């Protein structure tokens, strides 16, 4: 997959020429160490789409047309740049401001030409499903053989791209037969939530019923919005779940429920 | 499948050679449709049956095994019109609306199942859109076989062969092409024939470009195939629905 | 049995040249009626069948099941000689068989009625909508046609399969005729083909259907015993009367 | 076999039956009581002889029906049987 | 196949540092000798370990050398692991006799006493791999938060022990001791939990102890004993309730104080498990700072729905401080 490497080396260049983002990453790296010297900030760097067009249109059209192949190499590149920062004493997140849009759509107008493509929905958010942990990194301790043992759990919303599902439970006695106790509090949990979004009540065409679609909010984004708030979500538009085609059960046309991952959630008035 | 070649050759020869004196109605229907980015075609059956009786003889026989060979047949034509070489171009939906003989809702009982049925009723409510699939890639959980499955219409289980098993195939949603679907539900008109009983409502699935074509409460005349789905609720008792190709609202209605 | 085929050779004679009320064969006129109406229910009076011979009438109170299948094919033969056609129309006509006393009501029923045609009567209760049943199986190959069933289906393809409408209606016993201190027990009724939609809720209906069981079916949890379901597969439908 | 069971209902003779849930008479029970009903299934030709809202005398055959230990290489309750019925009471 | 990556924190010599923390002490003879022996004397069960003194010890072990690896951060960083590690050390330094212990006296102590008597006898006869250390306890280790008046040392950021909002709670606090506060909700009534539950065999006897791990366990039959095994043929074995070690268990949910709720949203309750002595300490309607390790207990299934794994967690109670005595 040398092309995924290409995406990383390409996104590298975008940063530090121009350097207008790098100062913000430095600011994030410094502020937390300042809290380390004291006596909270989410780690994500807002990327204005504004700037992306000046360098490459080829890579610009891609983030909109096929975000699954693009956002994650750009992301691995951002971590890679955050580690070359200063110094020692996490996946981060992209944001994507914009410079909308195409892809501008209210939730009423969407599906399927807009699927598997970046999207900025806007509408009312209800009913705001209750905040809950989600397991990601498995961490264990072997004794007396020692070392340090970890598994990595890949969920449905892991990264972006689809991957062979890891879940569930714990390995327990990975070879050889050594005992593995779960190490809690070293292991990583990203919070996770979903919130459905109804189209704006005032732009509703007729007595025809409202059509809402669900947005999963990863990491920091969680608990950022009470229900009934004007919201412009952004995110990649994802279709998850089999349509029933996987197994015999069940029998019916209905299928492929869709939702939006991430991403930003700019409130508005 | 030389027979499918034989059928599709007849459909191409029906689109390219059709003449209403003297413009080619279909062939231009096509161009004027790809330019606006409609990606659809509306066949007028009377012209069809005028052209060959034969292809309508088979199309009213086993519609759901044929109509998709007509779709691929027409999109293979838009390849030679809308573009030229020496992408991507979805396989167009065809909407066919024709007179025939109106078959009222009460009078649909078996016997015409999988035979095109024109009818008339007032739509109750329209169901919220949901996507089916058209072209989706699939990888194996183990041997990692990369399979591109072209799903057609008109449910379909995934293939189990490249332990391995029983069904080690994952849907890749990063490359999968999706369409839309509606589910109208229509109550037959109050004038006829309620008698003393509450009127029945057959469930209908619109799709692609007919979707959101009709505001609930407006009288319409649907065409479509008639067919049955399972939906556990025995024995066996499969329940009836009408696939729509294609819908035409009453005058005007805009 | 093959002997039963010879029975057909007799009943066909009953089907056409049988006369009553000074000439003018009645069943000939029924075949002529549908016939023109082509409603595919041929209708045979039990009174006359019993009048000609009690041996067949006894076969109706013993084993109606396979004998109707023997009988209606012959009815199709009679329609075939009278109208050299209907190879294109329905290719099956199942006979209606008017009143058959008995005249067991509802609540009086036993095991002795199994597999044997029995008349029932009472009010209809709200009926299910019309859901086409599988019946015959056919495909382009590709095993052959498989009839299933009434009602098991053990032990799916489809290409062109001949569907026949199914409808299940719950028949409850008439409120006027209930003996005091007793609840109005009721039985399941299975309509088929044209019998569909003939019924309406709120009405008393006279049915000739045979009685059936299968197949436990489903309890095995709260009974304590191997108890079958009670379902009357229906034959004819008439207003009261 | 093994194999299929297999179910054949034409060769199998059937009989009866109707369940009734028997409850103690109200004159004996010392309210506050909350009288305890129990199942009696009528098997036999005494089927249908029973009436709702009335006292009946039965033939005992108490048995038990499944509805505590396990059978290893069970949940039971009293279900009373009656093979005879009378309207006495 | 399941990669491994080293960490600067090592439990081996940290255990050593725990052992040096216990029974070798000055500042408060030492408190860990008397506090331990009073438990060994069986008038006392709960062992209240203050993190304050762990803080005091490092000063003597640093400046004031010789310098050592840190605990107070390393404890609350994990805090589950130390219950199975920091607390087992007590077994090595504990006074053996200790005084006037007898046998009965106590119920169920005679059982195990006769277990080890018959085991010692029969083993010493056979020779002419042992009962688990968790079965023999009869005491519970509880950490407490450092608020603290002496936390001003200062180790600054070292404190949680930050009397935080239920809203403030994150998925990044799992496996790390956290104080929380709110009103007690629903306060479910106490029921016995289980730990070992050594079932009894039949023919040749012995014993086997099945670990009670996570929420639930699967019961086993077969035979584990080699004697009953294969000849002839597999001995039958049943669980003995007298032999088992029971730890009180009481669960209760705690809604937020509602002043800690923003202009929006809704009060969010948090489920809290209680064990040992701390049981019944909690009462409904009472604002309390409850401190404890913050942990998941998966999944019992379901397991189809989530997917994943979607832990949903709970708070293990450790210490309890209620407002308004
Ligand atoms: Zn043994």
From Swiss-Prot, chain A:
Transmembrane segments: none
Compartments where located: Nucleus
Listed GO MF terms: ATP binding; ATP hydrolysis activity; chromatin binding; DNA replication origin binding; helicase activity; MCM complex binding; single-stranded DNA binding
Gene Ontology biological process terms in this record: DNA replication initiation; DNA strand elongation involved in DNA replication; double-strand break repair via break-induced replication; mitotic DNA replication initiation; pre-replicative complex assembly involved in nuclear cell cycle DNA replication; premeiotic DNA replication; silent mating-type cassette heterochromatin formation; subtelomeric heterochromatin formation
Principal cellular location given in the protein's record: nucleus
A GO cellular-component term linked to this record: MCM complex
Quaternary data: Component of the MCM2-7 complex. The complex forms a toroidal hexameric ring with the proposed subunit order MCM2-MCM6-MCM4-MCM7-MCM3-MCM5; loaded onto DNA, forms a head-head double hexamer. Interacts with CSM1.
Any further remark recorded for this protein: Present with 35100 molecules/cell in log phase SD medium. Early fractionation of eukaryotic MCM proteins yielded a variety of dimeric, trimeric and tetrameric complexes with unclear biological significance. The MCM2-7 hexamer is the proposed physiological active complex.
Identification of the protein by name: DNA replication licensing factor MCM3
Taxonomic source organism: Saccharomyces cerevisiae (strain ATCC 204508 / S288c) (Baker's yeast)
Source lineage: Eukaryota, Fungi, Dikarya, Ascomycota, Saccharomycotina
Swiss-Prot record, chain B:
Biological processes annotated in GO: DNA replication initiation; double-strand break repair via break-induced replication; heterochromatin formation; nuclear DNA replication; pre-replicative complex assembly involved in nuclear cell cycle DNA replication; premeiotic DNA replication; regulation of DNA-templated DNA replication initiation; subtelomeric heterochromatin formation
Any one annotated GO CC term: nuclear replication fork
Keywords, ordered alphabetically: ATP-binding, Cell cycle, DNA replication, DNA-binding, Helicase, Hydrolase, Nucleotide-binding, Nucleus
Molecular function in Gene Ontology: ATP binding; ATP hydrolysis activity; chromatin binding; DNA replication origin binding; helicase activity
Note from the entry: Present with 10300 molecules/cell in log phase SD medium.
Function: Acts as a component of the MCM2-7 complex (MCM complex) which is the putative replicative helicase essential for 'once per cell cycle' DNA replication initiation and elongation in eukaryotic cells. The active ATPase sites in the MCM2-7 ring are formed through the interaction surfaces of two neighboring subunits such that a critical structure of a conserved arginine finger motif is provided in trans relative to the ATP-binding site of the Walker A box of the adjacent subunit.
Family as reported in the entry's similarity comment: Belongs to the MCM family.
Name of the protein described by the UniProt record: Minichromosome maintenance protein 5
Lineage per the UniProt record: Eukaryota, Fungi, Dikarya, Ascomycota, Saccharomycotina
Swiss-Prot record, chain C:
Domain of life where this protein originates: Eukaryota
Record's subcellular location: Nucleus
Stretches of the chain forming a coiled coil according to its record: none
Family according to the record: Belongs to the MCM family.
Note in the entry: Present with 1690 molecules/cell in log phase SD medium. Early fractionation of eukaryotic MCM proteins yielded a variety of dimeric, trimeric and tetrameric complexes with unclear biological significance. Specifically a MCM467 subcomplex is shown to have in vitro helicase activity which is inhibited by the MCM2 subunit. The MCM2-7 hexamer is the proposed physiological active complex.
Function noted in UniProt: Acts as a component of the MCM2-7 complex (MCM complex) which is the putative replicative helicase essential for 'once per cell cycle' DNA replication initiation and elongation in eukaryotic cells. The active ATPase sites in the MCM2-7 ring are formed through the interaction surfaces of two neighboring subunits such that a critical structure of a conserved arginine finger motif is provided in trans relative to the ATP-binding site of the Walker A box of the adjacent subunit.
Subunit text: Component of the MCM2-7 complex. The complex forms a toroidal hexameric ring with the proposed subunit order MCM2-MCM6-MCM4-MCM7-MCM3-MCM5; loaded onto DNA, forms a head-head double hexamer.
Record's protein name: DNA replication licensing factor MCM2
Lineage: Eukaryota, Fungi, Dikarya, Ascomycota, Saccharomycotina
Swiss-Prot record, chain D:
Name of the gene this protein is made from: MCM6
Misc remark: Present with 13400 molecules/cell in log phase SD medium. Early fractionation of eukaryotic MCM proteins yielded a variety of dimeric, trimeric and tetrameric complexes with unclear biological significance. Specifically a MCM467 subcomplex is shown to have in vitro helicase activity which is inhibited by the MCM2 subunit. The MCM2-7 hexamer is the proposed physiological active complex.
Role according to the record: Acts as a component of the MCM2-7 complex (MCM complex) which is the putative replicative helicase essential for 'once per cell cycle' DNA replication initiation and elongation in eukaryotic cells. The active ATPase sites in the MCM2-7 ring are formed through the interaction surfaces of two neighboring subunits such that a critical structure of a conserved arginine finger motif is provided in trans relative to the ATP-binding site of the Walker A box of the adjacent subunit. The six ATPase active sites, however, are likely to contribute differentially to the complex helicase activity.
Top-rank taxon, per record: Eukaryota
Annotated compartments: Nucleus
Family assignment from sequence similarity: Belongs to the MCM family.
Whole-protein coverage range: 340 to 463 of 1017
Name of the protein: DNA replication licensing factor MCM6
Phosphoserine modified-residue sites: 33
């Amino acid at each position: 997959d040398a092309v995924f490497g290409d995406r990383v080396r390409r996104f590298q260049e975008f940063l530090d020429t121009f350097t207008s983002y790098r100062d913000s990453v430095r600011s994030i790296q410094v502020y937390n160490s300042n809290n380390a010297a004291n006596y909270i900030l989410p780690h994500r760097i807002i990327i204005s789409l504004d700037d992306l067009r000046e360098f490459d249109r080829s890579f610009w059209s891609g983030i909109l047309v096929e975000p699954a192949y693009f956002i994650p190499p750009a992301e691995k590149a951002l971590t890679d740049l955050a580690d070359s920062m200063d110094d020692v004493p996490h996946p981060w997140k992209l944001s994507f401001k914009g410079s909308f849009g195409a892809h501008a759509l209210s939730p009423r107008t969407l599906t399927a030409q807009h699927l598997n493509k970046l999207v900025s929905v806007e509408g009312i958010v209800t009913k705001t499903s209750l905040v809950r942990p989600k397991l990601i990194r498995s961490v264990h301790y072997a004794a007396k053989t020692g070392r340090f043992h970890y598994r990595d759990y890949t969920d449905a919303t892991t990264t972006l791209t689809t991957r062979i599902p890891t879940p569930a439970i714990y390995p327990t006695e990975d070879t050889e037969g050594n005992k593995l106790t779960t190490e809690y509090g070293y292991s990583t949990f990203i919070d996770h939530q979903r919130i459905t979004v109804q189209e704006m009540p005032e732009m509703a065409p007729a007595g025809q019923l409202p059509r809402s679609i669900d947005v999963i909010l990863d990491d920091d984004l969680v608990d950022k919005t009470k229900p009934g708030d004007r919201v412009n979500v952004v995110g990649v538009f994802k279709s998850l779940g089999a349509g029933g085609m996987n197994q015999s059960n069940s029998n019916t046309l209905i299928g492929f429920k869709t939702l939006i991952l991430g991403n930003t959630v700019y409130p508005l008035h | 499948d030389d027979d499918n070649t034989e059928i599709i050759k007849s459909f191409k020869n029906f689109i390219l050679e059709f003449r209403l004196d003297s413009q080619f109605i279909y062939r231009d229907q096509l161009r004027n449709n790809i330019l606006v980015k409609n990606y659809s075609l509306t066949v007028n059956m009377e012209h069809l049956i005028g052209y060959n009786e034969d292809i309508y003889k088979k199309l009213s026989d086993e519609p759901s095994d044929i109509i998709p060979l007509f779709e691929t047949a027409i999109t293979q034509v838009a390849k030679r019109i809308s573009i030229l070489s020496r992408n991507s171009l979805p396989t167009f939906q065809l909407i066919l609306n024709s007179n025939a003989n109106q078959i009222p809702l009460r009078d649909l009982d078996s016997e015409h199942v999988s035979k095109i049925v024109r009818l008339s009723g007032i739509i109750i409510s329209t169901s919220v859109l949901s996507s089916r699939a058209t072209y989706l890639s699939i990888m194996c959980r183990n041997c990692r076989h990369t399979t591109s499955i072209t799903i057609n219409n008109f449910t379909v289980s995934l293939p189990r062969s490249c332990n391995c098993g029983p069904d080690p195939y994952i849907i890749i949603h990063e490359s999968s092409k999706f369409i839309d679907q509606q589910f109208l539900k229509l109550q037959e008109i109050p004038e006829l024939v309620p008698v003393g009983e509450m009127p029945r409502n057959l469930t209908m699935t619109c799709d692609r470009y007919l979707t959101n074509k009709v505001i609930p409460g407006t009288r319409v005349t649907i065409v479509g195939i008639y067919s049955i789905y399972n939906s556990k609720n025995g024995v066996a008792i499969r329940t009836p629905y009408i696939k729509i190709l294609g819908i035409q609202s009453d005058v005007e209605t805009s | 049995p093959n002997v039963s085929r010879t029975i057909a050779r007799e009943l066909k004679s009953f089907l056409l040249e049988y006369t009553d009320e000074t000439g003018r064969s009645v069943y000939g006129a029924r075949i002529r009626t549908l016939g023109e109406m082509n409603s595919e229910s041929l209708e045979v009076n039990y009174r006359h069948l019993a009048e000609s011979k009690a041996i067949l009438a006894l076969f109706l109170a013993k084993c109606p099941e396979e004998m109707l299948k023997i009988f209606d094919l012959v009815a199709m033969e009679a329609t075939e000689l009278h109208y050299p056609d209907y190879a294109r129309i329905h290719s099956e006509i199942h006979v209606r068989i008017s009143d058959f006393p008995t005249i067991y009501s509802l609540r009086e029923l036993r095991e002795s009625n199994l597999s044997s045609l029995v008349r029932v009567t009472g009010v209809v209760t709200r009926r299910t909508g019309v859901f086409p049943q599988l019946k015959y199986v056919k495909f382009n190959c590709l095993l052959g046609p498989f009839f299933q069933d009434s009602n098991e289906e053990i032990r799916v393809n489809g290409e062109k399969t001949v569907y026949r409408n199914y409808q299940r209606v719950t028949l409850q016993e008439a409120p006027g005729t209930v003996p005091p201190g007793r609840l109005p027990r009721h039985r399941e009724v299975i309509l088929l083909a044209d019998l569909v939609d003939v019924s309406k809720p709120g009405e008393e209906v006279e049915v000739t259907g045979i009685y059936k069981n299968n197949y436990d079916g489903n309890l095995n949890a709260k009974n304590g015993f191997p108890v079958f379901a009670t379902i009357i597969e229906a034959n004819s439908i008439k207003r009261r009367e | 076999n093994r194999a299929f069971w297999t179910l054949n209902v034409t060769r199998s003779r059937f009989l009866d039956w109707q369940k009734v849930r028997i409850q103690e008479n109200a004159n004996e029970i010392p309210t506050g009581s909350m009288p305890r009903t129990l199942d009696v299934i009528l098997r036999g030709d005494s089927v249908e002889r029973a009436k709702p809202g009335d006292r009946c005398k039965f033939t005992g055959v108490e048995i038990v029906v499944p509805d505590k230990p396990s059978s290893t290489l069970l949940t039971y309750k009293i279900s009373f049987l009656a093979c005879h019925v009378i309207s006495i009471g | 196949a399941l990669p491994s990556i080293q960490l600067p924190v090592d439990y081996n010599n940290l255990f050593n540092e725990i052992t040096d923390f216990l029974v070798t002490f000055k500042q408060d003879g030492p408190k860990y000798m008397a506090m331990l022996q009073k438990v060994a004397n069986r008038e006392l069960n709960s062992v209240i370990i203050d993190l304050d003194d762990i803080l005091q010890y490092q000063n003597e072990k640093f400046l004031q050398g010789t310098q050592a690896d840190d605990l107070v951060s390393a404890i609350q960083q994990n805090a589950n692991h130390f219950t199975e590690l920091f607390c087992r050390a007590i077994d090595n330094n504990m006074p053996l006799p200790t005084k006037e212990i007898d046998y009965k006296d106590d119920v169920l102590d005679v059982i195990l006493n006769q277990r080890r008597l018959r085991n010692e006898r029969m083993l010493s006869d056979r020779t002419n791999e042992l009962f688990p250390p968790n079965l023999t306890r009869r005491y519970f280790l509880y950490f407490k938060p450092l608020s603290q008046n002496c936390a001003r040392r200062y180790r600054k950021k070292a404190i949680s022990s930050k009397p935080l909002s239920v809203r403030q709670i994150k998925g990044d606090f799992l496996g790390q001791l956290i104080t929380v506060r709110g009103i007690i909700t629903r306060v479910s009534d106490v029921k016995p939990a289980v730990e070992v539950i050594a079932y009894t065999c039949d023919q040749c006897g012995y014993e086997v102890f099945q670990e009670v791990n996570s929420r639930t366990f699967t019961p086993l039959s077969e035979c584990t004993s080699e004697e009953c095994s294969q000849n002839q043929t597999k001995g039958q074995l049943f669980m003995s309730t007298r032999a088992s070690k029971f730890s009180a268990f009481q669960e209760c949910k705690i809604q937020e104080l509602s002043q800690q709720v923003p202009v929006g949203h809704i009060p969010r309750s948090l489920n809290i498990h209680v064990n040992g002595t701390l049981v019944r300490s909690l009462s409904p309607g009472d604002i309390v700072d409850v401190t404890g390790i913050f942990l998941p207990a998966p999944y019992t299934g379901f397991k189809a729905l989530k997917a994943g794994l979607l832990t949903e967690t709970y708070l293990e109670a450790q210490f309890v401080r209620q407002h308004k005595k």
